[PDB]
């Protein structure tokens, strides 16, 4: 819109604010895996001269192998390898006010898809393959791996919560690799306490390892309402990952009260517009991709 000024997707301020917004998104999640920033696809800034700025960000993201509940650092979590890749886009409306040292993510939304199995097969026909999380063999691997893990826990026993990842490959026979969350068995409540990796091969041979969540803080404070949705593969560009982020459908613009961020009690209102479309985009957008390793890139 008229007050929405486009910015270059490679600008330091833009990339820093994008990092803040994405770590806020990750903190706001309690399901799935931590997202990683590949680049800023587009960015518009609404400057408001004492209420700071509001950035309308379009982000190209990749799923890592860290579960969000691990709360690990962005630098201990790398994008998944290409045959199990999950990618898409997030839109975020991020508010920053430098003189007052205020950060806030009033709204976001992400749309992700797993990489097309056809493209994977084209580039690596013998690679491991993701499978449905409800696959009987995946559920069996989870069950038996957790059974073994409990067998070697004298006092504490754990129960399955949900399979979060499943994969099939050939290791001198059919093999299934799964990840799943575990909770403490009633003996404390029914909340995820860790994530386990389970495996079956070939009368099956079983392996199991578990990681328990610990506390973890970084340059990002709060992240209200938003959602991450997972759509199916592309059977076969722009609008491959449709994302709606409309706090207001009013071209006039609405006002959002953010007084809780500032020391004074009242009269701190932020102008919000409908999220800007792809036209009037800076020639420096989209920015340069950070992942150039084809071992982690989607086609
Ligand atoms: C992006 O900015 C960095 C400096 O932070 C520069 O080294 C790099 O060449 C830029 N890439 C562009 C403009 O594509
Ligand atoms: C975020 O996406 C959901 C659909 O997954 C949609 O219902 C919701 O309105 C979106 N949020 C905004 C602020 O538009």
Author numbering: 31 to 217, 229 to 243, 256 to 269, 296 to 315, 326 to 388
Please quote the paper that reports this structure.
Fetuin-B is a highly selective and potent inhibitor of metallo­peptidases (MPs) of the astacin family, which includes ovastacin in mammals. By inhibiting ovastacin, fetuin-B is essential for female fertility. The crystal structure of fetuin-B was determined unbound and in complex with archetypal astacin, and it was found that the inhibitor has tandem cystatin-type modules (CY1 and CY2). They are connected by an exposed linker with a rigid, disulfide-linked ‘CPDCP-trunk’, and are followed by a C-terminal region (CTR) with little regular secondary structure.
Examination of the crystal packing of the protein expressed in mammalian cells explains why it crystallized in its unbound form, whereas the material produced in insect cells did not: endoglycosidase H processing of the high-mannose N-glycans of the HEK293S-derived protein (a step performed during purification) left a single N-acetyl­glucosamine moiety attached to N40 that stacks against W200 of a symmetry-related molecule. CY1 and CY2 are just rotated by ∼10° with respect to each other when going from the unbound to the complexed structure. The only functionally relevant differences in the cores are found at the tips of hairpins I and II of CY2 [inset in Fig. 1(e)], which however are very likely to result from crystal contacts in the unbound structure. Hairpin I is in a noncompetent conformation for binding, and becomes folded out towards the CPDCP-trunk upon complex formation.
